[PDB]
């Protein structure tokens, strides 16, 4: 909602959600072909009246220009702003300044073409199980911090169109066969960092492996909202809240 | 804080082939509800005085290492983003960018930490570099 005057809330608050999607392309050989973070900040704004907001991030260009280059920042690329943001201010001195809409919306979006390890690594080895029975041994490892946990991770493993009679055995999570998509999907409700899990599958008798996941309480880029300033004419009590979610986006490992 | 400083004070005194390429567990976890914020005037002032009172920083020769020890200590023990202890570029005296921080770096460029209460009132760095603000 475009904020007309005299919006009113019992409690003046903002919630920000820093969401980062990870794009990843690995080769059969394990060579990271491409690797990229696509991030955005969603705001849910519950603010009375007609406030003026200023968003403080560990933006590198800002730090470099404000004598804070020695400090750890994040180099934002292809930044794009919701229309409420005053581009001139951002252009001039990197200020993020805006009168917000009411309710929900995406303040900004950005990229990083940084190349850190894949959060989640898949190895899939194909052996001959019996007869024209074929076996897939697969390892999945979380390469993110032990103190963090991915949720609802799904590992999509393509199998041949003519396979049948799958049988599966896994240490953790669960597997199913999806013939329509001609693949198997290994699901893990909850996957702590610094873990290695194994699944085995065989069948009677390509696309890449892809994985879905979400890691709350966590960023890849290391972006931080330092502060959110709220200036309304009343001079009221407003509170900003923040959280950081990483998730997959386009995460593919080539088989060969 | 208080028991914390003497430990970290010594650490600071102590400070002063190939790079062992460093490895990651990827990413930056955020401890769910613990709030993190930039250093405040009052906190900067209090701390300046605390360190002044207890001694250890005054006349210590500055290095990035030694500063880092300090900033991280405050970060862990107090939740202040360690982007606050920057000083104006030299040469000459280096004035803190954080108004409230009552130390500055004076050539003895080999610099050292020097307390100066005027800095709680005269935001010099802002005079010298309004653009930073």
């Amino acid at each position: 909602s475009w904020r007309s005057e005299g919006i009113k809330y019992r409690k003046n608050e903002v919630f920000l959600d820093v969401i980062e999607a990870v794009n990843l392309l690995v080769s059969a050989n394990g060579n990271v072909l491409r690797s990229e973070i696509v991030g955005s900040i969603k705001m849910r704004v519950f603010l009375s009246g007609m406030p003026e907001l200023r968003l403080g991030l560990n933006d590198k260009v800002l730090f470099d220009n404000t004598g804070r280059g020695k400090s750890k920042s994040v180099e934002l690329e292809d930044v794009k702003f919701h229309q409420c943001v005053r581009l001139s201010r951002f252009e001039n001195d990197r200020t993020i300044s805006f009168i917000p809409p009411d309710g929900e919306f995406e303040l900004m979006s950005y990229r990083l073409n940084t190349h850190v390890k894949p959060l989640i690594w898949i190895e899939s080895v194909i052996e001959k199980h019996s007869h024209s029975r074929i076996e897939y041994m697969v390892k999945a490892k979380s390469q993110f911090k032990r103190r963090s946990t991915a949720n609802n991770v799904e590992i999509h493993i393509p199998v041949p169109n003519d396979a049948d009679s799958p049988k599966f055995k896994t240490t953790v999570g669960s597997v199913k066969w999806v013939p329509e998509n001609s693949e198997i999907v290994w699901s893990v409700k909850s996957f702590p960092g610094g873990k290695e899990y194994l699944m085995r599958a065989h069948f009677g008798l390509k696309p890449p492996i892809s994985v879905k996941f979400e890691i709350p309480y966590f960023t890849t880029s290391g972006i931080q909202v330092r502060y959110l300033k709220i200036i309304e004419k009343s001079g009221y009590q407003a509170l900003p809240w923040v959280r950081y979610i990483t998730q997959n986006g386009d995460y593919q490992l080539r088989t060969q | 804080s208080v028991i914390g400083w003497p430990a970290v004070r010594e650490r600071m005194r102590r400070a002063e082939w190939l790079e062992a390429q460093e490895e990651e567990e990827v990413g930056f976890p955020v401890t769910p509800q613990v709030p993190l914020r930039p250093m405040t005037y009052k906190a900067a002032v209090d701390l300046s005085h605390f360190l002044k009172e207890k001694g250890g920083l005054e006349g210590l020769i500055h290095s990035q290492r030694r500063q880092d020890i300090l900033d991280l200590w405050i970060y862990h023990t107090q939740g202040y983003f360690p982007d606050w202890q920057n000083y104006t570029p030299g040469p000459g005296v280096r004035y803190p960018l954080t108004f409230g921080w009552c130390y500055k770096l004076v050539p003895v460029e080999v610099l050292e930490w020097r307390f100066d209460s005027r800095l709680a009132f005269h935001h010099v760095a802002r005079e010298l570099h309004p653009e930073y603000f």
Binding site: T66, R68, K229, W241 | -
Partner: peptide, 12 residues
């Protein structure tokens, strides 16, 4: 679950 954020650049 959200963390509370700062209301200004106290540090600058």
């Amino acid at each position: 679950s959200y963390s509370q954020a700062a209301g200004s650049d106290s540090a600058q």
